[PDB]
Design a protein around this nucleic acid. Structure first.
Ligand SMILES: [Mg+2]
Ligand SMILES: [Mg+2]
Ligand SMILES: [Mg+2]
Ligand SMILES: [Mg+2]
Ligand SMILES: [Mg+2]
Ligand SMILES: [Mg+2]
Ligand SMILES: [Mg+2]
Ligand SMILES: [Mg+2]
Ligand SMILES: [Mg+2]
Ligand SMILES: [Mg+2]
Ligand SMILES: [Mg+2]
Ligand SMILES: [Mg+2]
Length: 231
RNA sequence: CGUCGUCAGCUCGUGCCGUGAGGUGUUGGGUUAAGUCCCGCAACGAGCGCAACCCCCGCCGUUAGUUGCCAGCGGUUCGG
């Protein structure tokens, strides 16, 4: 499912703001820009997707993590396709390490779903309606994707392992495997299954994540053709 | 019971950082009479305080009309 002209969309970036541990995944710096060995990206995807597929057909969740503005929506898109949890907005410390406690906050969201499902007394004061609404709206912003996650994930998918340092550290502290799209400014050794490629351009994120989902959806029953994306 | 002080504060649970005392939260930007509320944040919640629920006063209504009141009509000893 992997394709070959990802060259058409990314082959890496960033001038010498690199992490030396990312050396083995670099071809050269042509424009004064670290360019990624796309053959390495291929070979890695082969190893990585193999892990993904196996995890899919054994029926276990993958928590997709993206928070940078460019990968914001694109992860809500494709993770929804998989029907798998994501965190798009703020990564709340202890989402894994303090799971049960954060999960105490979906119940609130849950209980606000029901209460506002009407009426169960709209005879609650004026000032309260506005409040609890603002609450639900609020809760909705952050726990929208995390609410699907009803128990500790089997692995996580990160768009930027550097940006998402905390998440990488939480999962790792829990022996939960970590798969990641990572460019030259990330730390390879911290990542279990690497996608050495640009993590900034939405194009690359789109290619890698959508095609990642195509692995997920295909392996747990049926398949499907193209998924929503901005040019 | 007094006092600091009606001052806006004092903490806990779990997670995170530290060998450790302990830190974080509770800091930060805005706001309020207020840890008041908003936004942000390795923190996410919870409690005791704050506030509100109570009393008096200020406007109005309903229910009542004496021992209280007297607008209007009668007597009016000349004082509802
Ligand atoms: Mg980057
Ligand atoms: Mg020290
Ligand atoms: Mg320790
Ligand atoms: Mg402490
Ligand atoms: Mg603590
Ligand atoms: Mg304090
Ligand atoms: Mg303190
Ligand atoms: Mg402040
Ligand atoms: Mg005060
Ligand atoms: Mg408060
Ligand atoms: Mg805070
Ligand atoms: Mg009076």
């Amino acid at each position: 499912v992997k394709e070959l002209l990802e060259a058409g969309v990314h082959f890496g970036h960033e001038r010498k703001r690199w992490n030396p541990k990312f050396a083995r995944y670099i071809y050269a710096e042509r424009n004064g820009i670290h360019i990624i060995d796309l053959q390495k990206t291929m070979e890695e995807l082969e190893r990585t997707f193999r892990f993904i597929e196996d995890l899919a057909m054994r029926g276990g969740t993958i928590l997709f993590v993206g928070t940078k503005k460019q990968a914001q929506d694109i992860v809500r898109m494709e993770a929804e396709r998989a029907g798998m949890p994501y965190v798009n907005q703020r990564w709340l410390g202890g989402m894994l390490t303090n799971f049960k406690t954060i999960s105490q906050r979906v119940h609130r969201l849950e209980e606000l779903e029901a209460l506002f499902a009407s009426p169960e007394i709209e005879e609650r004061p004026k000032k309260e309606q506005v409040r609890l609404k603002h609450e639900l709206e609020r809760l909705q912003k952050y726990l929208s994707g995390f609410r699907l996650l009803k128990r500790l994930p089997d692995a996580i998918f990160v768009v930027d392992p550097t940006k998402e340092a905390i998440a990488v550290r939480e999962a790792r502290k829990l022996f939960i495997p970590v798969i990641a799209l990572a460019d030259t400014d990330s730390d390879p050794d911290l990542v279990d299954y690497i996608i050495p490629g640009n993590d900034d351009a939405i194009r690359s994120i789109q290619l890698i994540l959508s095609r990642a989902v195509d692995l997920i959806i295909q392996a747990r029953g049926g398949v499907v053709e193209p998924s929503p994306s901005y040019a």
